[PDB]
Amino acid sequence: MSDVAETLDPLRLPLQGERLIEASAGTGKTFTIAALYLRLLLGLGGSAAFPRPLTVEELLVVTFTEAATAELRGRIRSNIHELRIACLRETTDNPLYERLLEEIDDKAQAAQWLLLAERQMDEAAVFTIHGFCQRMLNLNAFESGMLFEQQLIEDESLLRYQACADFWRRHCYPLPREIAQVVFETWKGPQALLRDINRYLQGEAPVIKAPPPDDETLASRHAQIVARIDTVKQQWRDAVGELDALIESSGIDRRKFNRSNQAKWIDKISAWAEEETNSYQLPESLEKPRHPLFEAIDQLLAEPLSIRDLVITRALAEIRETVAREKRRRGELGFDDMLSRLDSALRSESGEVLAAAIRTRFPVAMIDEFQDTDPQQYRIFRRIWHHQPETALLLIGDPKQAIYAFRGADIFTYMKARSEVHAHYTLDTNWRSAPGMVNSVNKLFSQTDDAFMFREIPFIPVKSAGKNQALRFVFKGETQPAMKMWLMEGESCGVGDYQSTMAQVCAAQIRDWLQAGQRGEALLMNGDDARPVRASDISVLVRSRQEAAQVRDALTLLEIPSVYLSNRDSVFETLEAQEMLWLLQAVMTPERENTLRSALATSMMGLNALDIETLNNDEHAWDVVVEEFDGYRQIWRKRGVMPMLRALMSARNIAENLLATAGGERRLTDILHISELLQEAGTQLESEHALVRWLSQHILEPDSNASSQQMRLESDKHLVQIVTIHKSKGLEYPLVWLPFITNFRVQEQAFYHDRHSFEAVLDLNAAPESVDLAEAERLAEDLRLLYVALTRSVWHCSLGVAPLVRRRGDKKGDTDVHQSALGRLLQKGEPQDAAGLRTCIEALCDDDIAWQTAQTGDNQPWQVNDVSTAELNAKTLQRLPGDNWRVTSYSGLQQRGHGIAQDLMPRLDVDAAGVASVVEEPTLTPHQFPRGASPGTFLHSLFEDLDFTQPVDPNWVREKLELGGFESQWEPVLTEWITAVLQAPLNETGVSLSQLSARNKQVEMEFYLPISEPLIASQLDTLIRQFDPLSAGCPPLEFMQVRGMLKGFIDLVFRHEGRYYLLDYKSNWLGEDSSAYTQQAMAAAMQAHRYDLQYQLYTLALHRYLRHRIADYDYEHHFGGVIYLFLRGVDKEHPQQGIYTTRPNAGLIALMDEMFAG
DNA sequence: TCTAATGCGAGCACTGCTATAGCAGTGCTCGCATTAGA
Ligand SMILES: [Ca+2]
């Protein structure tokens, strides 16, 4: 509690409301969480226990990373599973669980509560801050105002930009030249506005110290300014007199130079700008009898004269709501909104029902990484858990590791929270690291008081663990110290030098380690165990993409391969993408001589200058490559981009060759990665060209997702690893290098946190008091970064130090090294001589801490060899293709195009297809009814459920046409059409659909015929011919061998008192008129679409079906069917026109039926 | 086949004056760090 937290003993920590746990670097934050979790599930503890035992769905644990929750969740399903087993056994011989066991009172019961929890884990309330938010939101959607169906907006950077241009458009275009020019001089365009405000606009809006009056228009301020400007433009258009008497030295007569300038600064304004008229003022006039009445210049140079704060203020207020409105309209949600709307929800009046709701679901909650919260979160958290009995709020984290300033993480809202909760705790021991390492860090950050210079972030030392007392690092002889400062010489030192030199030094010391390690003289030792240092143990922490390169370079210069683990580039701007783009163009059109030559020229294909030339002179060889490429397009068109690309590669033997070519692995895996992306994108485009286009776009405007990020190679694991301070939080490394840990960069933007109210304030006038406050907050941050930096190592760490100077003040005992975190701890605060550094370092310095001077080096080798025995081969299978079983359906016939057609709509009028034109003739006849399948299946629909029996309501019909989206005005023609077709004589004898009651029809029957013994198109042809006069029009056997099944739909099967029939309604073709629906023409079309096949198949179906249903049925006493109504060509009085009938041989069905089974 | 960043001061050169030297200010050349971080 109170002052200097208590050394948290997990097992006795009071799980009752509000506890702040500080877990220093390497202290067990994770082991502790776990323990606590178990304690809560089994309501263990004592007077320090929680009131009741909780469930998995009640222990709220929030983490920051998606990866964090996963890990955390994985770690907990394990401690449960174990504490549980150790509960059946009632014995544990491993730390935590034993002490816990001691605390348990009915092992038998725990084991069942635990077993339940284990089973529940797929729902543990372990979420990310955002996850926690959309959940509380979605449940209580009425309080929050949420939609039940939201779309998680992902970008928002483009949404923001667009809002920003809209802003500019509606606020600048309409502006008159005088104001316009002014704005223009403040920002050339909306891109530059955003550049100045983009940070804000995101997350909580800062408070503006001194905003403009809630109404000043651009127009107004302008006035005031102009007017302040011209009144002084008048009292100068009178330089008649200014030609003055009494002297001074500085002030020369080349003042007549200064003069005219402003005399001529009398344009029609348009710019708040005004080159220097220092001399002719009056404030200095005296500072250099003296001057007269232009004390109006003393007044112009007092008041700022700018449009800046005014426009800015307006922009963010507005740009924000543009973004907002847009996101609502689209129906979306960004991440900041998720937890933002949850804040506004706990603050609305309807905020108690909500706080209570939540508080009930989650009585106790563990917030991890808490040092990285921000006003919005904290507020969500106290409003729900603060001062609330029957609940507990464990906030665990470490203020010394709060480095996410740039994202939104507020160290001040952490410091406030620290004020509001009174129970403080700390983890005292540093498992994970060597004692010297632990000692020198503690020493370093112990120098001055308030090392992190914010009394609220006090630094308390830590003890090193016993299990690690034996760790030590030896090199070419004896134990090296845990922390070594390398120190450049000289008095001054620019940022550019201290880098070239430091990167140099750092790479040198690395091969020196690395090769002394191949020889056994650099050992990582734990007591009497030792292993040589490999590259997988060196690690270089770095502050930016540039520094990293600077390192990779000096390292590469010694042949020492490296990896920048924090690399963000995308695979789309890799040069390999460009080549893939040429390659695809080539494939999509090898016709164009030029675009192919380019693809063959890409380095990826590995050709020669001699190669390219000769292929240009050998026209037969070229058309060979052209075929090869036509071959690829084909695979592309059928199987995909990946499949095509793999074909190409196997041919030009790409992967094999590339890998042989230095750095060729990088390239090869990027190429594959592009293909994996290229393949998804293709399944969302129905053209190859579209994809190509898809590539270009991604090559011209990249860095989108984390998905187009570069994948790291398996092996990068044996490369020295160069990472950023940020990606290193969490990570552990045997040895680490800090080549540029002394750099600073003065904060110049006045965005600071108020020292008393702890809120964020943006000062739109760089008032020095605020920039000063901002700057403090800047090293307040670098110290935290330094603390994360020193802390990743286990055995050793060495950082580069230099008498760094940035002030262009001529080495005035400068060395503003005291403005860097490391500099501030070394020089205890006060600035020093370039030599005063050297003496401070020496000052804290024995075995644990030591220094050497930047001893540069050279020796291009990393003298390491190889050996290799590729004794490989691949399993070849000895089974073979043989036969294919399938489910077909009179598709053995109808060639594709129907790909996915029969799939999306199982009953589409597949028999139709096409457009319709200038056949409009001003009097509707059934031949002018919309052509094709959509309309075609509209018809079939008509006859699916009718009352063939009664007459045709025309209302009913107007409704069918109205619902199916056809013009009502078709009702006259259609109703007249339906009846005609109902009242026609199919088989002369009675017949006529109209005589068929329900009980005698079966619409759309669906059959499945097994067809064993492949059905060879030929063998079926012979008998089809013999028995059918129609199929005598012999082009058939157009399909290929198929064993399997045979699907099929029968439009209608009806009976006419003894005698079953097969009806097939066929809306079909727009062949002008009548002349096309006569017994031949039909019989004609019949063969065109080989529909004859359909009959025979369909009746073999009806045959089998009837035979199966009608016990003791005979084909020729019950069948006699097959009617084919070409719906069009059907008149009330022109029978045998439109209708077609057949009655399969009965001798055909016979053979046919057994042609299936044998 | 196209273009190719600013900007800030220094840094040295030179030019009035006026109680040879320091205080000042005019002007072109040039080197330097800039970004960051998920
Ligand atoms: Ca049909």
3-state secondary structure A1080-1131: HHHHHHHHHCCCHHHHHHHHHHHHHHHHHHCCCCCHHHHCCCCEEEECCCCC
Question: With contact defined as beta carbons under 8 Å apart, do A1110 and A1118 qualify?
Answer: yes
Is strand B less than 7 A from the beta carbon of A730? no
User: Cα(A608)–Cα(A615) distance, rounded to whole angstroms?
Assistant: 10
Paired sense of beta strands A478-480 and A471-475, if any: antiparallel
CA of A248 to C1' of B25 (A): 13
Backbone angles phi and psi of A1090, in degrees to 5: 40, 40
As a rounded value in angstroms, the CA-to-C1' distance for A490 and B20 is: 37
In sign, the C-alpha dihedral spanning A820, A822, A823, A827 is: positive
Question: Strand (E) positions, A685-768?
Answer: 720-724, 733-738, 751-753, 760-763
Nearest residue to A539 (alpha-carbon basis) of A719, A756, A777: A719
Q: State phi, psi for A889 to the nearest 5 degrees.
A: -170, 40
Distances from the Cα of A464 to the Cα of A427, A637, A760, angstroms: 12, 64, 38
Beta-carbon contacts of residue A499 (< 8 Å; ≥ 6 apart): A547, A550, A739, A740
C1’ B4 / CA A629, Å:
39
Measured distance CA(A325)–CA(A310) in Å, rounded: 23
Separation of CA A909 and ligand 1 centre (Å)? 7
Contact A731, A791 (CB under 8 A): no
Q: State the Cα–Cα distance between residues A1079 and A1139, nearest whole angstrom.
A: 8
- Quickly count: other Cβ atoms within 10 Å of residue A293's Cβ: 8
If DSSP codes are grouped into helix, strand and coil, which group holds residue A813? Answer: coil
Cα distances from A714 to residues A536, A551, A717, in angstroms, run 12, 21, 7
Question: Phi and psi (nearest 5°) for A707?
Answer: -70, -25
CA angle A632, A637, A643 (to 5 degrees): 60
Contact call for residues A511 and A557 (beta carbons, < 8 A): no
The DSSP bridge pattern shows strands A471-475 and A522-526 to be antiparallel
Q: Is the CB of A406 under 7 A from strand B?
A: yes
CB A1038: neighbour CB atoms within 10 A?
13
**Beta-bridge partners for A616:** none
Q: Exactly one of A337, A1064, A1092, A1114 is catalytic; name it.
A: A1064
Q: Which residues contact A838 (CB under 8 A, 6 or more apart)?
A: A487
**Which strand B nucleotides have any atom less than 7 A from protein CB atoms?**
9-11, 15-18, 22-27, 32-38
| Lookup: nucleotide whose C1' is closest to A407 CA | B38
In contact, A706 and A524? CB cutoff 8 Å: no
Annotated binding site for ATP: which residue ranges of A? 23-30, 431
Is A899 buried (19+), middle (13-18) or exposed (0-12) by CB count in 10 A?
exposed
Q: Is A568 within 7 A of strand B by CB distance?
A: yes
* One-letter amino acid of A464: S
SS3 A623: helix
Pairing of strands A1123-1126, A562-564: unpaired
Distance between Cα A1064 and ligand 1 center (Å):
5
The residue with tokens 């509606």 is A170
Helix (H) or strand (E) segment spanning residue A433: none
Torsion, Cα A116 A121 A126 A131, to 10 degrees, reads -120
Task: Report which secondary-structure segment, H or E, holds A986.
Answer: none
Question: Tokens in use for A664?
Answer: 């060729």
- Cα separation, A153 vs A162, whole angstroms: 15
Gap from A250 CA to B12 C1', in Å? Answer: 19
> Closest protein residue to B19 using CA and C1' atoms?
A249
Ligand 1 centroid to A943 CA: how many Å? 11
Residue A533: which of A799, A790, A735, A714 has the closest Cα? A735
For residue A292, the one-letter residue type is: P
Strand B closer than 7 Å to the CB of A252? yes
* A216 secondary structure, DSSP code: -
- Report all structural domains of chain A as residue ranges with CATH numbers, in order of start: 1-154+334-427 (3.40.50.300), 155-333 (1.10.3170.10), 428-566+713-872 (3.40.50.300), 567-712 (1.10.486.10), 873-1158 (3.90.320.10)
Strand A463-464 to A429-430 pairing:
parallel
Neighbours of A210 (CB within 10 A): 10
Judge whether A1092 and A1124 are in contact, CB under 8 Å.
no
Span from the CA of A1066 to the centroid of ligand 1 (angstroms): 5
Tokens 């300038």 -> residue: A261
Contact A785, A403 (CB under 8 A): yes
Answer whether A41's CB lies under 8 Å from A56's CB.
yes
Nearest nucleotide to the CA of A543, by C1', is B36
Residue A248: nearest nucleotide (C-alpha to C1'): B17
Q: Tell me the residue type at A941.
A: S
Residues in contact with A142: Cβ distance below 8 Å, sequence separation at least 6, in sequence order = A350
The whole-angstrom separation of Cα A493 and Cα A837 is: 13
> Would the Cβ of A812 be found within 7 angstroms of any atom in strand B?
no
SS3 per-residue string spanning A144-200: HCCCCCCEECCCCHHHHHHHHHHHHHHHHCCCCHHHHHHHHHHCCCHHHHHHHHCCC
Angle between helix A1148-1157 and A1017-1027 (nearest 10): 160
Give the Å distances, CA to CA, from A246 to A243, A288, A289, A457. Answer: 10, 11, 7, 61
Give kind and range of the element (H or E) at residue A957: helix A954-963
- Are the C-beta atoms of A689 and A586 separated by less than 8 Å? no
- Name the residue closest to B32, CA to C1': A496
Specify the nucleotide whose C1' lies closest to residue A408 (CA). Answer: B38
Assess whether A495 (CB) lies less than 7 A from strand B: yes
Neighbours of A869 (CB within 10 A): 5
- A671 CA → B29 C1’, Å: 48
Distances (CA, A) of A1 to A5, A101, A414, A430: 6, 28, 17, 21
Is the CB of residue A549 inside 7 Å of nucleic acid strand B? no
> In Å, what is the separation between the CA of A287 and the C1' of B19?
18
Q: Answer for A464: CB within 7 Å of strand B.
A: no
How do A538-542 and A720-724 pair as beta strands? parallel
E strands, A334-487, are 364-367, 392-397, 424-426, 429-430, 463-464, 471-475, 478-480, 483-487
Q: Give A1111 Cα–ligand 1 centroid separation in angstroms.
A: 29
- Residue that has been written with the tokens 């800062």 in this structure: A206
Our answer to whether residue A1064 is catalytic in this structure is yes
| A425 touches A20 (CB < 8 A) | yes
Please name the nucleotide lying closest to A499, CA to C1': B33
Round to whole Å and give the CA distance between A807 and A830: 16
Q: DSSP labels for A826-878? A: HT-SS---HHHHHHHHHHS-STTEEEEE-------------------------
- Cα–Cα dist A558/A503, whole Å: 12
Q: Is the CB of A858 under 7 A from strand B?
A: no
The residue written with tokens 């937290």 in the block is A5
Residue A1072: CB atoms within 10 Å: 11
Kindly write down the DSSP assignment for every residue of A677-712, as one continuous string: HHHHHHTT-S-HHHHHHHHHHHHHS----STTBPPP
Binding residue positions of A for Mg(2+): 940, 1051, 1064-1065
CB A694 within 8 A of CB A681: yes
- Give the separation between CA A515 and CA A865, rounded to whole angstroms: 11
Q: Output the CA angle A773-A777-A778, nearest 5 degrees.
A: 115
Residue A921 corresponds to which tokens in the numbers above?
A: 């003739």
Tokens 């409301």 label which residue? A17
In chain A, positions 695-724 with C-beta closer than 7 Å to nucleic chain B are 724
**How close is the Cα of A1009 to the center of ligand 1, in Å?**
19
- A1104 alpha carbon to ligand 1 midpoint, in Å? 21
Dist. CA A50–CA A37, nearest whole Å: 11
Tokens encoding A836: 């005063």
CB contact at 8 A, A980 and A988: no
Contact yes or no for A524/A683 (Cβ under 8 A)? no
- Determine the distance separating the centroid of ligand 1 and the alpha carbon of A864, expressed in angstroms: 77
Specify the resolution in Å: 3.1
What kind and span of H or E run contains A1007?
A: strand A1001-1011
DSSP structural state of residue A710: P
* Cα-to-centroid distance, A971 and ligand 1 (Å): 22
Q: Identify whether the C-beta of residue A442 lies closer than 8 Å to the C-beta of residue A791.
A: no
How distant, in Å, are the alpha carbons of A4, A135, A1142 from that of A16? 20, 25, 88
Beta carbon of A731 within 7 Å of strand B?
Answer: no
CA–CA separation, A941 vs A907, rounded Å?
A: 10
Identify whether the C-beta of residue A1048 lies closer than 8 Å to the C-beta of residue A890. Answer: yes
What length is written for chain A?
Answer: 1158
User: Is the CB atom of residue A545 positioned under 7 angstroms from any atom of strand B?
Assistant: yes
Residue A40 tokens, joined: 């809560």
- Number of other residues whose CB lies within 10 A of the CB of residue A884: 11
DSSP H or E run through A1003: strand A1001-1011
The region, left, alpha or beta by phi > 0 then psi within -120 to 50, assigned to residue A988 is: left
For tokens 């009425």, the residue is A142
| H/E run at residue A111 | helix A107-120
Sign, CA dihedral A563-A564-A565-A567, equals negative
The sign of the dihedral angle between the CA atoms of A698, A702, A706, A708 is positive
Q: How far is the CA of A303 from the C1' of B19 (A)?
A: 38
C-alpha–C-alpha distance, residues A605 and A615, integer Å: 14
State whether the beta carbon of A745 lies below 7 angstroms from any atom of strand B: yes
| Nearest residue to B16 via alpha carbon and C1' | A252
Cα separation of A306 and A902, whole Å?
69
For residue A878, what are its two tokens?
Answer: 């000895």
A240 touches strand B (CB under 7 A): no
Contact in structure between A862 and A509 (CB atoms under 8 Å)? no
Beta bridge partners of residue A529, listed in sequence order: A526
Task: Find which nucleotide's C1' atom is closest to A726's CA.
Answer: B37
| Alpha-carbon span A442 to A436, nearest angstrom | 10
CA–CA dist A562, A721 (Å, integer): 6
A457 phi/psi in degrees, rounded to 5: -120, 70
Q: Are A783 and A451 in contact (CB under 8 A)?
A: yes
Tell me, in Å, how far CA of A748 is from C1' of B8? Answer: 15
Three-class DSSP category at A1054: strand
With beta carbons less than 8 A apart as the criterion, state whether A678 and A641 touch.
yes
DSSP readout, A864-885? ---------------------E
Q: How far apart are CA A449 and CA A1026, in angstroms?
A: 108
CA angle A783/A399/A12 to nearest 5° reads: 140
Q: How much distance in Å is there from the Cα of A725 to the middle of ligand 1?
A: 71
Sheet hosting strand A760-763, strand order edge to edge: A207-209, A760-763, A751-753
Q: Which of A779, A1117, A1127 is nearest to A940 (CA)?
A: A1127
Kind of pairing, strands A6-7 and A19-22? Answer: unpaired
Q: Smallest Cα–Cα separation from A31: which of A65, A76, A62?
A: A76
Q: Six-digit token pair at A1030?
A: 């129609």
The secondary structure of residue A794, as a DSSP letter, is: E
Q: How would you classify the pairing of strands A733-738 and A392-397?
A: unpaired
Residue bearing tokens 């958290």: A381
Scanning residues 515 through 544 of protein chain A, those with a beta carbon under 7 Å from any atom of strand B turn out to be 543-544
- Cβ contact A1042:A1074 at 8 Å: no
For chain A, how far is it from start to end, CA to CA, in angstroms?
91
Contact A129, A310 (CB under 8 A): no
A78/A745 Cα distance (integer angstroms): 46
Strand partners, A1011: A1044
